[PDB]
Design an enzyme around this catalytic site. Structure first.
Site, PDB file in Angstrom:
ATOM      1  N   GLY A 113       8.070  64.820  40.095  1.00  0.00           N
ATOM      2  CA  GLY A 113       8.942  65.864  40.619  1.00  0.00           C
ATOM      3  C   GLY A 113       9.000  67.129  39.774  1.00  0.00           C
ATOM      4  CB  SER A 114      11.360  69.955  39.872  1.00  0.00           C
ATOM      5  OG  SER A 114      11.196  70.143  41.259  1.00  0.00           O
ATOM      6  CB  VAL A 115      10.580  66.794  34.972  1.00  0.00           C
ATOM      7  CG1 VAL A 115      11.919  66.213  35.377  1.00  0.00           C
ATOM      8  CG2 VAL A 115       9.450  65.822  35.281  1.00  0.00           C
ATOM      9  CB  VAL A 116       5.519  68.557  35.940  1.00  0.00           C
ATOM     10  CG1 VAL A 116       5.651  67.040  35.851  1.00  0.00           C
ATOM     11  CG2 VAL A 116       5.428  69.024  37.388  1.00  0.00           C
ATOM     12  CE  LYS A 117       9.163  73.519  40.499  1.00  0.00           C
ATOM     13  NZ  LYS A 117      10.099  72.872  41.472  1.00  0.00           N
TER      14      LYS A 117
END
Ligand code: ZN
Length: 607
Positions: A324-328
């Site tokens: 999910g978005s934690v890799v942005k």
């Protein structure tokens, strides 16, 4: 010309201790029948020794191999001369070994002396081997000791059963092979080359396997020299045996236990409210970003078929999840490395519309229309537009709404995105001190849509350990460290217990992420504003809500993952929480769980 030969006997295995010194394994001392073989003992002689020994020992579950059946059949010297008589010394032994059927008629009591004969036969000339039998008691052992002289070769020696202790680290410790199951068969050749015997007990799993070289007991060694025929002259000693060296972990039982309890508490909560109905579990890894030391690796498996909850700390290194978005942060980093973004660059936050596919939005959807957004703000609001425009830039294109995309540069773009991801540990090997970590599910067949979803963490699957290394990398200013679960190697004190330090396992740098120091500071500002921001779009204020120290982190948006480090000024903990397939849009427990782990640690080890 004089004959040379040396024999060996194994010793006690080193033990495994938590960060505070509590033992995690047990060497329980026992007594066993031993046999010492002479070059002079014929097979008929060995048979006679088995039958005498069978009166004293119990044999329960004999699983004899054809090889063993045939050896026993051919022991009779006359029957060996006869079985080779009908055929069209070592080659002559093997060909005569394929000549008899194994459909032989042996009574059950017969199968018992065949088993023992096998055990004696397995022992190399002049060597001393253990003769596996049912557990012997004190009295049973005293009988055998008194009548040993009547069975030359037989004696009583001291061995050790290995048991794992009931703790939350019991799964990570791994296994050691039995003396009956012996040295693992598909590896026998590679151990014999090292110096191991055939019935040695060695680590077959996880830490026991990884630190096999450290845990294996030093052996007492004896030399025997031979005269004319090859007979024993005298038995001289080379080396005296000792207990294996010990290992201490970086994980503290108290802390590990409190994280497990916190995960169960949040999981049941979510299960109860229906949000976690189809969730496979929840996993959390906490690392020390200055050293790579593993502070806890916790997991709770929820079975989707029965419903049962079971511990699964190994899930942290073997199971893969969409991040999910934690890799942005890693996607923005790729924009800097590929000359797409320059410092804290402003993009338009707009819906992303490619031809022949559904518009892409962020969580706030259309609620604020199109508006300018910086990289700091892109992390803070968790913007998909930003990272999608960045990814499209890596592929060599500028976004214009309704564009037809050319995919001529797709393999190159995906390779560059995954390459950056790999610098943080996402999709690459972590370096952790276990024999076999999953490196994630990174598919080689993919298309444009996949490349785009990958940019906001919706394609490649990673392990909880990889996600922890990622945020520890951000915390350690781009310098990625190999996680280690062992802290140092230790000696033994006076009575087989944790003595003093031999070699502290030191930090290992793997790479440094190829971005500017000021670019790394932009990622630090982003992660800080996720938790300390005042916008309606600020995504992670829950990180700060009742935090004892300043927390920086990033939320994941189905999916309630989160990553964090603290304190912001001088990070000493970095945590990743993985909570897959949680449908609660209302409240997001990911950040709350990470905060609590950090609070748990701060209360335990003040920062
Ligand atoms: Zn010698």
């Amino acid at each position: 010309s004089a004959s040379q030969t040396k024999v060996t006997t194994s010793s006690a295995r080193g033990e495994i201790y938590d960060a505070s010194g509590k033992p995690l394994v047990e060497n329980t001392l026992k007594q066993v029948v031993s046999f010492t073989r002479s070059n002079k003992m014929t097979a008929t002689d060995l048979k006679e020794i088995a039958k005498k020994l069978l009166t004293y020992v119990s044999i329960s579950s004999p699983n004899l191999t054809e090889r063993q059946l045939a050896d026993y059949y051919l022991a009779d010297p006359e029957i060996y001369k006869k079985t080779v008589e009908a055929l069209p010394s070592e080659l002559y032994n093997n060909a005569v070994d394929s000549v008899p059927t194994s459909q032989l008629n042996y009574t059950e009591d017969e199968k018992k002396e065949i088993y023992l004969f096998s055990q004696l036969n397995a022992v190399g000339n002049f060597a001393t081997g253990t003769i596996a039998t049912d557990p012997l008691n004190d009295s049973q052992v005293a009988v055998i000791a008194s009548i040993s002289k009547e069975m030359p070769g037989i004696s009583i020696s001291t061995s050790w059963d290995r048991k794992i202790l009931e703790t939350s680290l019991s799964s990570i410790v791994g296994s050691v092979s039995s003396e009956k199951a012996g040295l693992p068969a598909e590896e026998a050749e590679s151990y014999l080359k090292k110096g191991y015997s055939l019935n040695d007990r060695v680590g077959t799993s996880y830490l026991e396997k990884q630190y096999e070289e450290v845990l294996q007991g030093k052996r007492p060694v004896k030399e025997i020299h031979l005269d004319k025929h090859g007979d024993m002259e005298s038995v001289e000693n080379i080396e005296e045996g000792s207990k294996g060296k010990n290992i201490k972990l970086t994980i503290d039982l108290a802390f590990q236990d409190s994280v497990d309890a916190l995960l169960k508490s949040y999981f049941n909560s979510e299960l109860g409210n229906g949000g976690a109905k189809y969730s496979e579990g929840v996993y959390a890894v906490a690392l020390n970003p200055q050293t790579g030391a593993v502070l806890s690796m916790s997991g709770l498996k929820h079975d989707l078929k029965t419903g049962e909850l079971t511990p699964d700390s190994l899930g942290t290194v073997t199971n893969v999840f969409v991040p999910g978005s934690v890799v942005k942060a890693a996607t923005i980093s790729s924009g800097w490395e590929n000359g797409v973004l320059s410092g804290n660059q402003t993009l338009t936050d707009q819906p992303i519309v490619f031809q022949g596919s559904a518009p892409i939005y962020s969580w706030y959807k259309l609620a604020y229309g199109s508006f300018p957004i910086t990289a700091v703000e892109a992390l803070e609001y968790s913007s998909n537009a930003y990272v999608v425009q960045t990814a499209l830039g890596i592929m060599g294109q500028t976004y214009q709404p309704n564009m037809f995309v050319g995919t001529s540069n797709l393999e190159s773009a995906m390779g560059k995105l995954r390459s950056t991801f790999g610098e943080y540990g996402l999709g690459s090997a972590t370096g952790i001190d276990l024999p076999d970590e999953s490196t994630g599910l990174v598919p080689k067949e993919y298309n444009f849509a996949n490349f785009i979803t990958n940019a906001f963490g919706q394609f490649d699957n990673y392990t909880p350990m990889q996600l922890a290394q990622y945020v520890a990398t951000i915390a350690n200013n781009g310098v990625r460290l190999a996680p280690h679960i062992v802290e140092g190697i230790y000696d033994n004190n006076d009575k087989g217990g944790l003595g003093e330090l031999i070699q502290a396992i030191d930090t290992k740098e793997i790479n440094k992420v190829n971005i500017s120091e000021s670019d790394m500071a932009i990622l630090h500002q982003g992660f800080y504003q996720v938790s300390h921001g005042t916008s309606p779009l600020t995504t992670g204020r829950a990180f700060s809500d009742g935090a004892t120290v300043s927390i920086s982190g990033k939320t994941g948006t189905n999916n309630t993952n989160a990553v964090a480090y603290a304190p912001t000024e001088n990070p000493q903990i970095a945590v990743a929480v993985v909570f897959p397939h949680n449908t609660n849009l209302t409240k997001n427990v990911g950040p709350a769980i990470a905060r609590d782990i950090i609070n748990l640690y701060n209360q335990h080890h003040p920062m």
